[PDB]
């Protein structure tokens, strides 16, 4: 199928508390597998998936160093951007980075990204073409010029196509299990009483896995896209996820209303009523 290896990086300066906090978190397809954190007593790349304890010393050594290397590089970047935006050494600031690749059935690179944000907003990003940047502001325009002279995009294209794709292929062989696995949503509707001869019908999806799911309500074949409340998918904590979606309906008329469950581990979509 389609597959991704994505890295989420954070750097938070914290004046009067010493050096910034640094974090590299890695994901294969929504599955966290590695984490490195600069506050930990043992600041080192660590597994976070059974199938990662798979890897030998020489590899965890390697990454920890690269990450120590990356940490120092952002420490300067927090300072560089202070410089760019004319900001004092008094405020906490955040650098965020999304980094990685996606490959298709044939294991060929579909999309590659290097995405930066400062203080919770787009700073600079590598365009799909993997040759050009879009810059959010006059500040980012400096990095753009800089990285244009240094050939950053040339360098990053090579990584995303060569190295990323290759590391991704490994990790998937490292754990086929737990990763390809699917838990279907167990669904039901719940009746809840309300003022003014009305009912709230709540459609539940529980213990499913991968997070992605769709719950819709319909009245007589038609989706009630307004009218309908809907919490954000939440982790159960056990590896699975939960979600509900509800609607309001007059006592007696419950049966005119169907709930629908769409989840990539379901044969046909599910259909339910009270």
């Amino acid at each position: 199928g389609p597959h991704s290896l994505r890295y989420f990086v954070t750097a938070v300066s914290r004046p009067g508390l010493g050096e910034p906090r640094y974090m590299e978190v890695g994901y294969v397809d929504d599955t966290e597998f590695v984490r490195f954190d600069s506050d930990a007593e043992n600041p080192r790349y660590e597994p976070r998936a059974r199938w990662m304890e798979q890897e030998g010393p020489e590899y965890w050594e390697r990454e920890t160093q690269k990450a120590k290397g990356n940490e120092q590089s952002f420490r300067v970047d927090l300072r560089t951007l202070l410089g760019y935006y004319n900001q004092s050494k008094g405020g906490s600031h955040t650098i965020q980075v999304i980094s990685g690749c996606e490959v298709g059935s044939d294991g060929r690179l579909l999309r590659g990204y290097q995405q930066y944000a400062y203080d919770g907003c787009d700073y600079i990003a590598l365009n799909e073409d993997l040759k050009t940047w879009t810059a959010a502001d006059m500040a980012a325009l400096i990095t753009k010029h800089k990285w244009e002279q240094a050939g950053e995009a040339e360098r990053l294209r090579a990584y995303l196509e060569g190295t990323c794709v290759e590391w991704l292929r490994r990790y998937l062989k490292n754990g086929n299990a737990t990763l390809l696995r699917t838990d279907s949503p167990k669904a039901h509707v719940t009746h809840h009483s309300r003022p003014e001869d009305k009912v709230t019908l709540r459609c539940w999806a529980l213990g499913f896995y991968p997070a992605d799911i769709t719950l819709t309500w319909q009245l007589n074949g038609e989706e009630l896209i307004q009218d309908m409340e809907l919490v954000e998918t939440r982790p159960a904590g056990d590896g699975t996820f939960q979600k509900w979606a509800s609607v309001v309906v007059p006592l007696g008329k419950e049966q005119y209303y169907t709930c629908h469950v769409y989840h990539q581990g379901l044969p046909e979509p599910l259909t339910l009523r009270w």
């Binding site: 890295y7 990086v9 590299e24 890695g26 390697r62 990454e63 690269k66 990450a67 290397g69 990356n70 590089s73 952002f74 300067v76 970047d77 560089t80 951007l81 980075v97 980094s99 290097q114 930066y116 700073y123 600079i124 990095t143 800089k146 990285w147 240094a150 950053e152 360098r155 990053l156 990584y159 190295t163 990323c164 590391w167």
Partner: peptide
């Protein structure tokens, strides 16, 4: 394996 970052 994460890339290594070029300074801004």
């Amino acid at each position: 394996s994460i890339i290594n970052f070029e300074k801004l």
